Amino acid sequence: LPPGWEKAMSRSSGRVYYFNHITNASQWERPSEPARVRCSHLLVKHSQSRRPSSWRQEKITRTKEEALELINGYIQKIKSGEEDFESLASQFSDCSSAKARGDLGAFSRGQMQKPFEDASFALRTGEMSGPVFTDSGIHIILRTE
Numbered sequence: 001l002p003p004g005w006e007k008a009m010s011r012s013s014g015r016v017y018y019f020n021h022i023t024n025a026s027q028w029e030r031p032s033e034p035a036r037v038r039c040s041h042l043l044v045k046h047s048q049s050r051r052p053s054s055w056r057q058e059k060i061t062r063t064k065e066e067a068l069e070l071i072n073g074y075i076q077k078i079k080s081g082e083e084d085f086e087s088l089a090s091q092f093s094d095c096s097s098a099k100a101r102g103d104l105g106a107f108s109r110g111q112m113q114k115p116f117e118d119a120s121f122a123l124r125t126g127e128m129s130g131p132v133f134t135d136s137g138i139h140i141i142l143r144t145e
Ligand SMILES: Cc1[nH]c(-c2ccccc2)nc1C(=O)O
Pocket: 043, 050, 051, 094, 095, 096, 104, 112, 113, 116, 134, 135, 136, 137
């Protein structure tokens, strides 16, 4: 299986699924290095973020756990097709890239927070991460190129 991916057992179904420990993605289907990738993200900040402030809210007070709960709700809606990623990034991301539907442009290794970068380089084009934790807060990442 590709970088980060491991086979696991579903705790509800007893069905096998696949989990990626670098991107925190999980899916039923079995899965399948560029100098550069392009990603969008949706950032949810919490009270322990390096800067507990954003365009959305002068003082961020939600807890880390309450942030993870928001992130998980947004991932469920994205995966159900109830909302799309760009639209949740625009409305709800605590990063100023929200104004570009979360798009960060192309970057190479050596530029982003390491957990952010490793998750980005382990997604294939089109794929979305699970919750990715950095000092900025909690991220959903979409690799677009
Ligand atoms: C406002 C913001 N954006 C990001 C970020 C983090 C990883 C990748 C791209 C942007 N960090 C922050 C921060 O305020 O800490």
